[PDB]
Design a protein around this ligand. Structure first.
Ligand SMILES: COc1ccc(-c2cc(Oc3cc(C)cc(OC)c3)cc(C)n2)cc1
Ligand SMILES: COc1ccc(-c2cc(Oc3cc(C)cc(OC)c3)cc(C)n2)cc1
Lengths: 93, 104, 100
């Protein structure tokens, strides 16, 4: 398992860790072997714009709607970002 | 589609954004792909090395012919804007379920 | 050819460069190292197993993989003070590149 949030929204660490932990919980849908990360990229753009944006890559679930939906609420509510500016990719050592 | 510039060259944000914006234009122009529907990013990695050396360097990943025109175009932008030798610029084209958050 | 170490272990730059250089050697031992990238990406909030304790993800792109993995794992265990349970090594064999 692996989850990466890539975003230009700056959160304090305590808040980042809550969010990552909440996403791990979600990622019920299908643990002690998982790697999550919040990668702060201030210059990240989408739609020709550097406004708040988050890209989520989940590697790994087939179910996938439940996870996407769940994550999208977490990030809208914890990152104060418009849900139009959330993209969730699922890729399925 | 997605362009990521990965580099140990530190630029101020205003400059980073100009560059990213110029690159988006290029992708759109040279490939005819829908502008706006692109990610770009500038990932500052100070300890990034190439050839056993931490000197100025650019890795450009383009994910998801005409391609020479694009590579060339980008290479000038980064040479100009980053003051990096073109002998330290590499431009890599590389290649599942997807959702927008408005669907929820 | 490319190695990226992704980790929440903060090292000073001189140390980071030594390690990256030691990894380049390894990759080279087990072609030559002038057509090769490496990087140390510090991600402080990186987690594994629900925990933000020390950890290393290594992605190796475009390259007896066991010899390389084993070698790198010792380097990182030694130089990052991380448990080897908390080190994972992926190889990707994923197309073209284009200055000089
Ligand atoms: C035998 O080769 C393998 C072994 C394990 C995986 C694997 C690894 C996965 O995630 C991780 C992620 C991280 C950080 C560590 C890990 O194990 C140490 C597994 C998730 C899935 C679904 N598969 C993939 C290939
Ligand atoms: C999946 O997209 C990809 C993946 C790998 C490459 C690639 C990667 C290569 O590795 C490198 C990387 C670097 C920094 C220098 C280099 O010397 C040419 C080769 C070489 C070639 C011919 N192609 C190009 C595109």
């Amino acid at each position: 398992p692996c989850c990466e949030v890539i975003t230009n929204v700056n959160l304090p660490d305590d808040n980042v860790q809550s969010t990552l932990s909440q996403i791990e919980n979600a990622i019920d849908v299908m643990l002690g072997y998982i790697m999550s990360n919040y990668d702060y990229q201030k210059n990240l753009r989408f739609g020709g714009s550097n406004e708040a944006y988050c890209f989520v890559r989940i590697t790994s679930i087939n179910n996938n709607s439940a996870l996407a939906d769940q994550i999208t609420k977490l990030l809208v509510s914890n990152l104060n970002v418009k849900s139009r500016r959330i993209y969730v990719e699922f890729r399925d050592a």
